[PDB]
Design an enzyme around this catalytic site. Structure first.
Site, PDB file in Angstrom:
ATOM      1  N   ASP A 226       0.755  -1.297   0.025  1.00  0.00           N
ATOM      2  CA  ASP A 226       0.099  -0.066   0.058  1.00  0.00           C
ATOM      3  C   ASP A 226       0.843   1.191  -0.078  1.00  0.00           C
ATOM      4  OD1 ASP A 226      -2.471   1.600   2.406  1.00  0.00           O
ATOM      5  OD2 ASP A 226      -2.228   1.770   0.339  1.00  0.00           O
TER       6      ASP A 226
ATOM      7  N   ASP B 108      -1.149   5.310  -5.810  1.00  0.00           N
ATOM      8  CA  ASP B 108      -1.643   4.863  -4.630  1.00  0.00           C
ATOM      9  C   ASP B 108      -2.006   3.140  -5.078  1.00  0.00           C
ATOM     10  OD1 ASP B 108      -2.723   3.721  -2.403  1.00  0.00           O
ATOM     11  OD2 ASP B 108      -4.527   5.041  -2.188  1.00  0.00           O
TER      12      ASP B 108
END
Ligand SMILES: CCCc1scc(-c2cn[nH]c2)c1C[C@H](NC1=NC(C)(C)Cc2cc(Cl)ccc21)C(=O)O
Ligand SMILES: [Zn+2]
Ligand SMILES: [Zn+2]
Ligand SMILES: [Zn+2]
Length: 378
Positions: free
Chosen positions: A34, A215
């Site tokens: 992440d 992201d």
């Protein structure tokens, strides 16, 4: 990085995970990569959707920090107890470090049904770590404890997180870098947007309102409200031979064609121009309909090919999610405060430049400084 190629598993819908070995005696768990967050946090109790969890009680090397942490999201939350433990990476470099690790003890809407991952590896910077920026992120510990070069890359097909290196077998052609505008999220600058070669013609600040980030933890390409609306109006004009319901454009509904008849054809390409390292240059990444029309094959219409529209509206800026990263080898070159993109070796999605602008305006947006962020010392 012979031993590091192909160390990832997963998909855009459910995420990309790396194997991580935590503690002695070792527990090897599957961890969601992440780049939108900064905490290393692992499921640490039983839960309906988890195949494995971190058992602190089997780890002789675990140390409780005697502090909790509460992590709310718009959509859900997680919480647990802070600790530290020894970590190594089965495919990664031949090192062991002592890292912060949050033992997740309760969560809501965070773990998803048969994800095959047990935890999250937050790879963004300490400025957005919880509970505050003094909890050192994983990769910061890695680099400080070991002399691993300060860079990692993601090839999102399987796939590969390559730690401390660039691997040339993973991409073809140009590697283009865009500067990191600020080390918190991996924040970048979008200078231009075209849909089928047609410029969307907005003030370039509108593209980075209030930020643009890379992201791996979000599925969609997310676009600020005004940019979203303008893109959908344009993508719509380009496929006006098919009239979809609203719910499709909202990401709420599949549309289908007889198996293998999809008119990719009527769907435009999307080009985002990223600010170059040289100050009046940019370069573009070109997104195919296949990256933004995601196939979902449910049950009773088994004979059709069906799709979700994977571009969604945002009020927190542009998010270049997993559906966008997938077509590319992405190099998070922390050491030099840049992000690289090249065509993955796993039409075609393209990385293309340079594009020169004579009068290049500043496209970045300055977020209003709250008394809260101004108070805190750094
Ligand atoms: C490419 C990976 C995308 C993933 S993996 C698991 C989820 C997820 C969705 N709901 N809960 C988890 C998602 C979708 C993703 N949402 C989320 N991504 C992560 C796991 C990084 C943080 C999070 C916390 C919470 Cl509490 C809810 C959703 C998310 C998104 O918004 O696009
Ligand atoms: Zn493996
Ligand atoms: Zn002070
Ligand atoms: Zn700080």
């Amino acid at each position: 990085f012979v031993e590091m190629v192909d160390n990832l598993r997963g998909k855009s819908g459910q995420g990309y995970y790396v194997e991580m070995t935590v503690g002695s005696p070792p527990q090897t768990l599957n961890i969601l990569v992440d780049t939108g967050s900064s905490n290393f946090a692992v499921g640490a109790a039983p839960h309906p959707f988890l195949h494995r969890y971190y058992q602190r009680q089997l780890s002789s090397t675990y140390r409780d920090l005697r502090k909790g942490v509460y992590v709310p999201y718009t959509q859900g939350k997680w919480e647990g107890e802070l600790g530290t433990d020894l970590v190594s990476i089965p495919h990664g470099p031949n090192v062991t470090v002592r890292a912060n690790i949050a033992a997740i003890t309760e969560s809501d809407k965070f773990f998803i049904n048969g994800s095959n991952w047990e935890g999250i590896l937050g790879l963004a910077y300490a400025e957005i770590a919880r509970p505050d920026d003094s909890l050192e992120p994983f990769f910061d510990s890695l680099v400080k404890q070991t002399h691993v070069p300060n860079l990692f890359s993601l090839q999102l097909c399987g796939g590969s997180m390559i730690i401390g290196g660039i691997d040339h077998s993973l991409y073809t052609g140009s590697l283009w870098y865009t500067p990191i505008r600020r080390e918190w999220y991996y924040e970048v600058i979008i200078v231009r947007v075209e849909i089928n070669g047609q410029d969307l013609k907005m003030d370039c600040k509108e593209y980075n309102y209030d930020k643009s980030i890379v992201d791996s933890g979000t599925t969609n390409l997310r676009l600020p409200k005004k940019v979203f609306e303008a893109a959908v109006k344009s993508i719509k004009a380009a496929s006006s031979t098919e009239k979809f319901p609203d719910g499709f454009w909202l990401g709420e509904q599949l549309v289908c064609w007889q198996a293998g008849t999809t008119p990719w054809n009527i769907f435009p390409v999307i080009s985002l121009y990223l600010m170059g390292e040289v100050t009046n240059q940019s370069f573009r990444i070109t997104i195919l309909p296949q990256q933004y029309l995601r196939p979902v094959e449910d049950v009773a219409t088994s004979q059709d090919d069906c799709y979700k529209f994977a571009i969604s509206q945002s009020s927190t800026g542009t998010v270049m999610g997993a559906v966008i990263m997938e077509g590319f080898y992405v190099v998070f070159d922390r050491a030099r405060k840049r992000i690289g993109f090249a065509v993955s070796a796993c039409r075609t999605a393209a990385v293309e430049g340079p594009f020169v602008t004579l009068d290049m305006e500043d496209c970045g947006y300055n977020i209003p400084q709250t008394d809260e962020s101004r108070s805190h010392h750094h």
